[PDB]
Amino acid sequence: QCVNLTTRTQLPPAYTNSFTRGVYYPDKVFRSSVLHSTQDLFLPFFSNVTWFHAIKRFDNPVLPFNDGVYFASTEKSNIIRGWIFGTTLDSKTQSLLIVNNATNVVIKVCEFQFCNDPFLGVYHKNNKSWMESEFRVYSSANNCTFEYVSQPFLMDLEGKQGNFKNLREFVFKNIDGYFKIYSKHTPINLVRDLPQGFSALEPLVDLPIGINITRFQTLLALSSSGWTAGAAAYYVGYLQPRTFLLKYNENGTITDAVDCALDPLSETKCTLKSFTVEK
Amino acid sequence: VNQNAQALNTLVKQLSSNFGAISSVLNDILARLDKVEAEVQIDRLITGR
Amino acid sequence: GIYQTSNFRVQPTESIVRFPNITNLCPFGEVFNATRFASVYAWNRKRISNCVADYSVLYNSASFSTFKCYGVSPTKLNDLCFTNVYADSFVIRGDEVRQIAPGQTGKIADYNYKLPDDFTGCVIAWNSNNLDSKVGGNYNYLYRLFRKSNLKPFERDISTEIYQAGSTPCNGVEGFNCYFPLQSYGFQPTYGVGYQPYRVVVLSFELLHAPATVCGPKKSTNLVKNKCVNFNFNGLTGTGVLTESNKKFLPFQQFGRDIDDTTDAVRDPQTLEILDITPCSFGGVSVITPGTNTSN
Ligand SMILES: *[C@@H]1O[C@H](CO)[C@@H](O)[C@H](O)[C@H]1NC(C)=O
Ligand SMILES: *[C@@H]1O[C@H](CO)[C@@H](O)[C@H](O)[C@H]1NC(C)=O
Ligand SMILES: *[C@@H]1O[C@H](CO)[C@@H](O)[C@H](O)[C@H]1NC(C)=O
Ligand SMILES: *[C@@H]1O[C@H](CO)[C@@H](O)[C@H](O)[C@H]1NC(C)=O
Ligand SMILES: *[C@@H]1O[C@H](CO)[C@@H](O)[C@H](O)[C@H]1NC(C)=O
Ligand SMILES: *[C@@H]1O[C@H](CO)[C@@H](O)[C@H](O)[C@H]1NC(C)=O
Ligand SMILES: *[C@@H]1O[C@H](CO)[C@@H](O)[C@H](O)[C@H]1NC(C)=O
Ligand SMILES: *[C@@H]1O[C@H](CO)[C@@H](O)[C@H](O)[C@H]1NC(C)=O
């Protein structure tokens, strides 16, 4: 059950600036109205971020993985349906699969004989139905290291809203053999810009996996050459170890941050443990 | 006033340093090792403080 | 005048041992009695979670030969709740049973299994000559005889690549300064001490990052309030008075340090209540006296 696919508008990468995005709670313990200073993997402020589209046009290449990655994707009808993670993706090394079924996302840590151009084949059908008979993800599952089923959330899978209300963020830290997911969603009424402003990123789940990943690719619904898919975009940022000043609020939410290596002014802010400096 | 309150905070945060020990809480190391082997760890904390 | 002496304190009154709810026993026994034990290069891995483990059966039993705990004391090992437990199982020759120690040198301790200096777990060894020795030789077990670069702690190496002893290219299935990475253990009953096979298991663990799940005797009592008591919510012993607080934890919050390092307001097991902690009242007594020559 593999069908190749190159019905893409081949385009070179587009770029954008990652202003103040990618701030997640470092540890589970709680603090309030204090300025803790910690160093960890993050997405450095003001960095170039790779851009791909999705509608004609079809962006789905394979991108490398290293020291985590920050995946964000604006969406209407949230065409994105899953990811893949692995070193070889040929039923040779343990591979990670996260299939978000409308019903619920099931974590399949099993070696998988993938396709050369895999994707969720959900049938282009234009009669108020999207019946799926194209399970075009893998071919063989000889052994499963792990298996899990999440909460049965049913998120909206239709719409052509003028402003992409849905804006979902994720981040995928793979350290000490544990997999981590921190996510947040916010309705947005702007049209294009990777939003300017600040937010946080709560955790959702952590997994014991103990697998070696260097490569990954997203998965999404879709006939092969022919479909009715709305506008969709997703940016990818590569993480980096840095140090931060995190200003918790009395409520307990991470309200603002300051980098410790961006520019000398920020470095003095980092040293003095204050958000303001007198002359 | 700032200088005096500067000292206490620098003094208080010193209570959260390994000083070479394997932890920074006495109740922890007391409830995590037998009697004969705790003294060597506790020594490093006392001389540090 | 006035003199400052012998500061006073409130005494505590009772104890609180509220642990999380009791679940089943851990299936470690079948691990420590598995049909077969994986070889050293590809040491078997087992994860322990969602069970209650009583270490008395494992410890008091003479079923073992050599026992040693490093970061903990096995006497009170049954009173600290662990976030996770690793059950690493393999069989080696009894000669190198000292190489298991963290920061040791040796062919097994350098090439195909390494430990960190701060390995917090406990290590058990148990002689296995009768069943693991084969009258013809238990050659099922191999080992990484040579490695290009000694591996970091807890990284399994599975390649069967032919060794390169020299800079000259290695060619064919075998070649000049080419050798198989693995050499088979011989295990026969004729062997003496140190030569006979051993079943060795190590039990590392990790602390406090997430609410722990493995525990021992639970004996949760109550949530008495405004009483100087000795609380032991999960293995964080401490004293003081427990009050209700209008504070709020997000669904993934306990252990509010809340200023610098103090275990301030904390949630509880058995239920979900955001409590608070304040140490019992303290102060330094002082005696004001006229001259003892005058009056007493
Ligand atoms: C990064 O983006 C800027 C535009 O913001 C562009 O001028 C520059 O060439 C980009 N650099 C890279 C890494 O392509
Ligand atoms: C998810 O969707 C795929 C493709 O339709 C299907 O094979 C699989 O059984 C589904 N799993 C769940 C949890 O429904
Ligand atoms: C999958 O891996 C296991 C070892 O974990 C192995 O025994 C098995 O042969 C592999 N493939 C199959 C057929 O399940
Ligand atoms: C992961 O795989 C890569 C590519 O084969 C290898 O270079 C690296 O050493 C591996 N790392 C681990 C932790 O196994
Ligand atoms: C913080 O808590 C107060 C009191 O409950 C509430 O009025 C306010 O809206 C909260 N703010 C945030 C950031 O949630
Ligand atoms: C769980 O805890 C509650 C409150 O202590 C108790 O009433 C209940 O019986 C417990 N259930 C189990 C699984 O022991
Ligand atoms: C294995 O089984 C025997 C049965 O007599 C028992 O004595 C021994 O303690 C068991 N070993 C372990 C710890 O699994
Ligand atoms: C006792 O000693 C005090 C000084 O402490 C002195 O003033 C006083 O005159 C002495 N005589 C008396 C009244 O006992």
Swiss-Prot record, chain A:
Annotated glycan sites: N4, N48, N101, N127, N143, N212, N251
Resulting phenotype, W130R: In strain: Omicron/BA.2.75
Name the segments for region: Disordered.
121-142, 151-163
Mutating K125E: what's the consequence? In strain: Omicron/BA.2.75
- What's the effect of swapping D59A? In strain: Beta/B.1.351
Result for mutant: T7N:
In strain: Gamma/P.1
| UniProt effect for mutating A54V | In strain: Eta/B.1.525, Omicron/BA.1
Outcome of mutating R81I, per the record?
Answer: In strain: A23.1
Q: Which cysteines are joined by disulfide bonds?
A: C2-C115, C110-C144, C260-C270
Consequence of substituting H124Q: In strain: Omicron/XBB.1.5, Omicron/EG.5.1
The outcome of changing I188V is: In strain: Omicron/BA.2.75
For this entry, the protein name equals Spike protein S1
Q: What part of the entire protein does this chain span?
A: 14 to 310 of 1273
